[PDB]
Amino acid sequence: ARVKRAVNAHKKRRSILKASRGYRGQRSRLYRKAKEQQLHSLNYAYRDRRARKGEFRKLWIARINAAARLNDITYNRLIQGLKAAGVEVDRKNLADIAISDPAAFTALVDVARAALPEDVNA
Amino acid sequence: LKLHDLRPARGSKIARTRVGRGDGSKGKTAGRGTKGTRARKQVPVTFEGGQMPIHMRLPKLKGFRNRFRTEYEIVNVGDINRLFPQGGAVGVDDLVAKGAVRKNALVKVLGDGKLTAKVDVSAHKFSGSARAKITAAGGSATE
Amino acid sequence: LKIDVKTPAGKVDGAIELPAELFDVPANIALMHQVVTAQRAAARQGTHSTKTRGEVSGGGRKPYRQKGTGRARQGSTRAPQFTGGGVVHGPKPRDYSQRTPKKMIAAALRGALSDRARNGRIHAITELVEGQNPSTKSARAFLASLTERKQVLVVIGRSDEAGAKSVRNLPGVHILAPDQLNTYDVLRADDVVFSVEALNAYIAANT
Amino acid sequence: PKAKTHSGASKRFRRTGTGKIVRQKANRRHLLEHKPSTRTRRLDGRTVVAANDTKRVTSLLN
RNA sequence: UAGACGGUGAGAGCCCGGUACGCGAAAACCCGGCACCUGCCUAGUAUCAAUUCCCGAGUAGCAGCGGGCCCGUGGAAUCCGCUGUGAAUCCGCCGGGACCACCCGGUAAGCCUAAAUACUCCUCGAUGACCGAUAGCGGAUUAGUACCGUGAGGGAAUGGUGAAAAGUACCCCGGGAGGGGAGUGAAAGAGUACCUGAAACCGUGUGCCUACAAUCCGUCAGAGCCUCCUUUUCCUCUCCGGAGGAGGGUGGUGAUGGCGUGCCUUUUGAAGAAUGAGCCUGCGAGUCAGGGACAUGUCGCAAGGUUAACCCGUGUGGGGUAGCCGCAGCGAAAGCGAGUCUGAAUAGGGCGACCCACACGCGCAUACGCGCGUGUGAAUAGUGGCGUGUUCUGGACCCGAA
RNA sequence: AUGCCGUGGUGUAAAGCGUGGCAGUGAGACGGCGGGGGAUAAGCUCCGUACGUCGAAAGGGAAACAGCCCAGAUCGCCGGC
RNA sequence: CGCGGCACAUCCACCUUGUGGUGGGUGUGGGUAGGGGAGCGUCCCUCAUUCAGCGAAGCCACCGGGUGACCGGUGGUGGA
Ligand SMILES: [Mg+2]
Ligand SMILES: [Mg+2]
Ligand SMILES: [Mg+2]
Ligand SMILES: [Mg+2]
Ligand SMILES: [Mg+2]
Ligand SMILES: [Mg+2]
Ligand SMILES: [Mg+2]
Ligand SMILES: [Mg+2]
Ligand SMILES: [Mg+2]
Ligand SMILES: [Mg+2]
Ligand SMILES: [Mg+2]
Ligand SMILES: [Mg+2]
Ligand SMILES: [Mg+2]
Ligand SMILES: [Mg+2]
Ligand SMILES: [Mg+2]
Ligand SMILES: [Mg+2]
Ligand SMILES: [Mg+2]
Ligand SMILES: [Mg+2]
Ligand SMILES: [Mg+2]
Ligand SMILES: [Mg+2]
Ligand SMILES: [Mg+2]
Ligand SMILES: [Mg+2]
Ligand SMILES: [Mg+2]
Ligand SMILES: [Mg+2]
Ligand SMILES: [Mg+2]
Ligand SMILES: [Mg+2]
Ligand SMILES: [Mg+2]
Ligand SMILES: [Mg+2]
Ligand SMILES: [Mg+2]
Ligand SMILES: [Mg+2]
Ligand SMILES: [Mg+2]
Ligand SMILES: [Mg+2]
Ligand SMILES: [Mg+2]
Ligand SMILES: [Mg+2]
Ligand SMILES: [Mg+2]
Ligand SMILES: [Mg+2]
Ligand SMILES: [Mg+2]
Ligand SMILES: [Mg+2]
Ligand SMILES: [Mg+2]
Ligand SMILES: [Mg+2]
Ligand SMILES: [Mg+2]
Ligand SMILES: [Mg+2]
Ligand SMILES: [Mg+2]
Ligand SMILES: [Mg+2]
Ligand SMILES: [Mg+2]
Ligand SMILES: [Mg+2]
Ligand SMILES: [Mg+2]
Ligand SMILES: [Mg+2]
Ligand SMILES: [Mg+2]
Ligand SMILES: [Mg+2]
Ligand SMILES: [Mg+2]
Ligand SMILES: [Mg+2]
Ligand SMILES: [Mg+2]
Ligand SMILES: [Mg+2]
Ligand SMILES: [Mg+2]
Ligand SMILES: [Mg+2]
Ligand SMILES: [Mg+2]
Ligand SMILES: [Mg+2]
Ligand SMILES: [Mg+2]
Ligand SMILES: [Mg+2]
Ligand SMILES: [Mg+2]
Ligand SMILES: [Mg+2]
Ligand SMILES: [Mg+2]
Ligand SMILES: [Mg+2]
Ligand SMILES: [Mg+2]
Ligand SMILES: [Mg+2]
Ligand SMILES: [Mg+2]
Ligand SMILES: [Mg+2]
Ligand SMILES: [Mg+2]
């Protein structure tokens, strides 16, 4: 029997072209170019799904540092003091608190400052 | 019943390997990989790279072959005893019928195994031990 | 083990004993499958064909020069990559038929008939039409009385022309001689209908 | 088409009663003056084919 | 006795051509029969005699050089050719693998001979787990045509309205082409550029973004707009519906922030300034044959398994024992045989057979077994088919020279 | 000093050995240590090294940076060390 | 390391206590040449069944699904 390729062969073409909508140039029009761009896109997405955890932690740390220095303490000693006081509030929730309830953040700062040792350089 | 109920035994049929059909299987070189002779041709079995091959550096097996050699289809007295526990006269055609020997061939009796039945067997070219066992059991061994 | 012999437009007139070694063999599905496959393979014609690059018309000379042109070198105009060129590893005429041993063939047929007998789908009749003049109407009525299923196998002697012609053109009815029974036809049939002479001939042939 | 066997291989190898392949040893045709009788006795007789060459020898013989 | 196939306005045994089945030939040709006709037979059968003649000539044989036989000149028979020499007629001559003797077979150098075997330009009748318009013949179309070449030669491309032309009367713009309105049609989302009508590619409208920015063109984070739906409070006109307000969710777009050196091939190593690719659609590469070879999965039978050709059947079925493999090995071989070869060896070695988780009697040792008789039942085994991997001979995965 | 052979203990799943089926590979590169050739030059060349990485290894660090340092990606998370 | 999903191997007990399933531990799961195992999609034939001029195929759009090749539903076009 002789089999024409077209019916089977068009399924992956349709899927790739549908996925590549919104690209500019040949990358959204031609199947061969959309395929290469799809390879790159999915590798980028895989890499960035892992990297975005670090990026969000970085943003939280920056905002927490801002709030701590507003309350006159470094991020260094604030984290050390919270660990000493045994407060296990997350960095994400710490940043959320810093933005939303400044009074609560201030209370946490006093707690950490009290829990800090009398001389941090000994 | 009902031809739509017949199926093959498990493991009797397996799918063949289709070897040039993309990356998820034997990919593009189809299991060859190389760039040399084996990428496009077969290497003859007799070839050893140029040094004198195994079948050429070794000597010919000595001797000759006999053009007029006579071959016998053999049977042991143990087999005869097993096939004929009742004894009695035994011949070449009886051996053929019982299937212990090939047809249209000379039959020779050998003396391996033990024999208790009394059998007057007839064949060609008995062995000494078989003759002794026949006469000890009480039968006769005649050509 | 004991079936009743029926007459057309009549009643019972005898009984036939089915020996166990022929109608009580256990059903071996794998063996039956192999034999049926070999049958359908032997039924193929295998008359497909294509032309290779050596058999396509023309294509003898090298189309143009190897070098100095800026195009791929081509060798012939009937190379397989060309439109209108030869077919690579295309179909050729083939012989599909296998060497299934007689013991397996006979065992599969016996198993099929054993399944039929065990399930009670075997009927014996003296004859299909009373006279020597075929009558599809009366034959169809007789088979409708005997059974109600779509597929029927009729095993009758090769000399019973009136019975053959009476059911020849009935849909869902298949005819074959006693010595031509086989697994594919028996397994396709919902019921098997034997003439008395045919059944005796088959039993005598198989001892 | 029936498979053909190798002529030199059939002249130089043979099988035993259980299926092993045996061969004769080289260095024993001429120039025997300087070879000690110990060496010639070692070279005498038949020996089995090495497990490294058994596959190729089997393919040649079949 | 007809349910083959095809057509008919869509899947028809009962509408049509037909099908089963049955009839039918002036004449011509083929075949057969009967006569005419032709020709042969018109005494030699056996017995005896062993005296004579004949039994295929420049032939056979021989020598030289060659060819061909499994046989490559070899110790080279048999067969064929040229050159030379050159027999005999049965007490002859030739063959049985140099040659000789004996024995066996046959009767060269004249001719004819059916059937079983090979093939299909062609003519009928069938079929297909064959193609279906880049396929299948080069050729469904003007096809060995157009066209190319001085010539021998080479050698294309182009099928489909509709059930039925019912193929758009008439009017309008327009030189026409083309279109609009009418009209036909089930459908003009079938208008002779015509079934369906994909992609590349080219427009028009529209939502969002874009003219201070250095971008493998994406991805993650992300405001703002636009659009469509819902939960609140508001127009309560509310049967409305929802404008509008908030919230929530779809979908489109993406200011702005980070990260980020295209694909393939070949390479120690390429984003590479190494190769290849303008784009889309279609086509384009591990196949088939064989009782081939090796190994495996599975199935049948099992110390046996299995048929080849061929025969008979409408078939895929039934016959068919010739053969093959297994059944004992060792040896160069004669040969011998559970042994065999080497050897002076009843020495040792090589190859091959030989079971014990055990019992009983026998000698055995404290026990363990050592050979035998049986079980305490100690487990072998091949062969044929069908799948798969590899391999052999074939073009042998596909493409490519001078 | 190491390395190597044997042996008795202890530990350790995906070690080892035999026999078959199917392979690919047989142009390596850089770095550390020990050497030869060279001028003790070479991003030079040739050997050794139960030495490493790349090849065939992504991720973090070294500005960028196959072969250097850390570390071997089953997938998801807007968790922690 | 934490929490959740997947797979391979091994071990431990049940179900036919290995053809394989049930639950629980432990280890493992980068990968070129290459080896093994199991699958998706297209076409044709056979058997059974089922849909179709109240609209098949093919194509296009939208909404969903699966660990992958890929799949389903709805609508539009189309006419076997
Ligand atoms: Mg966009
Ligand atoms: Mg992390
Ligand atoms: Mg590729
Ligand atoms: Mg390979
Ligand atoms: Mg190679
Ligand atoms: Mg190479
Ligand atoms: Mg290559
Ligand atoms: Mg060869
Ligand atoms: Mg040489
Ligand atoms: Mg040609
Ligand atoms: Mg050529
Ligand atoms: Mg053509
Ligand atoms: Mg063609
Ligand atoms: Mg047969
Ligand atoms: Mg010698
Ligand atoms: Mg000597
Ligand atoms: Mg019809
Ligand atoms: Mg004569
Ligand atoms: Mg001569
Ligand atoms: Mg010659
Ligand atoms: Mg000769
Ligand atoms: Mg002469
Ligand atoms: Mg002779
Ligand atoms: Mg003649
Ligand atoms: Mg003839
Ligand atoms: Mg054509
Ligand atoms: Mg078409
Ligand atoms: Mg001209
Ligand atoms: Mg109308
Ligand atoms: Mg329409
Ligand atoms: Mg239309
Ligand atoms: Mg057009
Ligand atoms: Mg159209
Ligand atoms: Mg601006
Ligand atoms: Mg810059
Ligand atoms: Mg960006
Ligand atoms: Mg950057
Ligand atoms: Mg280079
Ligand atoms: Mg480039
Ligand atoms: Mg460039
Ligand atoms: Mg370069
Ligand atoms: Mg180059
Ligand atoms: Mg260049
Ligand atoms: Mg280029
Ligand atoms: Mg096949
Ligand atoms: Mg087998
Ligand atoms: Mg021998
Ligand atoms: Mg000697
Ligand atoms: Mg010995
Ligand atoms: Mg078997
Ligand atoms: Mg050392
Ligand atoms: Mg191996
Ligand atoms: Mg080399
Ligand atoms: Mg090298
Ligand atoms: Mg150094
Ligand atoms: Mg150096
Ligand atoms: Mg270097
Ligand atoms: Mg080094
Ligand atoms: Mg490489
Ligand atoms: Mg890395
Ligand atoms: Mg490594
Ligand atoms: Mg790195
Ligand atoms: Mg920390
Ligand atoms: Mg890992
Ligand atoms: Mg892996
Ligand atoms: Mg691979
Ligand atoms: Mg309609
Ligand atoms: Mg179709
Ligand atoms: Mg549709």
TrEMBL record, chain A:
Keywords: Ribonucleoprotein, Ribosomal protein, RNA-binding, rRNA-binding. GO terms for cellular component: ribonucleoprotein complex; ribosome. It comes from the Bacteria. The keyword Signal does not apply. GO terms for molecular function: rRNA binding; structural constituent of ribosome. One of its GO terms (biological process) is ribosomal large subunit assembly. Belongs to the bacterial ribosomal protein bL20 family. Binds directly to 23S ribosomal RNA and is necessary for the in vitro assembly process of the 50S ribosomal subunit. It is not involved in the protein synthesizing functions of that subunit. This is Large ribosomal subunit protein bL20. It comes from Mycobacterium tuberculosis.
UniProtKB/TrEMBL annotation, chain B:
Keywords: Ribonucleoprotein, Ribosomal protein, RNA-binding, rRNA-binding. One of its GO terms (cellular component) is cytosolic large ribosomal subunit. InterPro entries: Ribosomal_uL15, Ribosomal_uL15/eL18, Ribosomal_uL15/eL18_sf, Ribosomal_uL15_bac-type, Ribosomal_uL15_CS. GO terms for biological process: translation. The keyword Ribonucleoprotein applies. Transmembrane segments: none annotated. GO terms for molecular function: rRNA binding; structural constituent of ribosome. The keyword Plastid does not apply. Residues 1-39 are annotated as: Disordered. Residues 1-8 have a biased composition (Basic and acidic residues). Residues 74-142 form the Large ribosomal subunit protein uL15/eL18 domain. It comes from the Bacteria. Belongs to the universal ribosomal protein uL15 family. Binds to the 23S rRNA. Part of the 50S ribosomal subunit. This is Large ribosomal subunit protein uL15. It comes from Mycobacterium tuberculosis.
From TrEMBL, chain C:
It comes from Mycobacterium tuberculosis. The keyword Ribonucleoprotein applies. Residues 41-98 are annotated as: Disordered. GO terms for cellular component: ribonucleoprotein complex; ribosome. Pfam families: Ribosomal_L4. Part of the 50S ribosomal subunit. This is Large ribosomal subunit protein uL4. The keyword Transferase does not apply. InterPro entries: Ribosomal_uL4, Ribosomal_uL4-like, Ribosomal_uL4_dom_sf. GO terms for biological process: translation. Keywords: Ribonucleoprotein, Ribosomal protein, RNA-binding, rRNA-binding. GO terms for molecular function: rRNA binding; structural constituent of ribosome. One of the primary rRNA binding proteins, this protein initially binds near the 5'-end of the 23S rRNA. It is important during the early stages of 50S assembly. It makes multiple contacts with different domains of the 23S rRNA in the assembled 50S subunit and ribosome. The lineage of its organism: Bacteria, Bacillati, Actinomycetota, Actinomycetes, Mycobacteriales. Belongs to the universal ribosomal protein uL4 family.
UniProtKB/TrEMBL annotation, chain D:
Belongs to the bacterial ribosomal protein bL35 family. Pfam families: Ribosomal_L35p (PF01632). One of its GO terms (cellular component) is cytosolic large ribosomal subunit. GO terms for biological process: translation. GO terms for molecular function: structural constituent of ribosome. Keywords: Ribonucleoprotein, Ribosomal protein. SUPFAM superfamilies: L35p-like (SSF143034). This is Large ribosomal subunit protein bL35. It comes from Mycobacterium tuberculosis. Residues 1-21 are annotated as: Disordered. InterPro entries: Ribosomal_bL35 (IPR001706), Ribosomal_bL35-like (IPR021137), Ribosomal_bL35_CS (IPR018265), Ribosomal_bL35_sf (IPR037229).
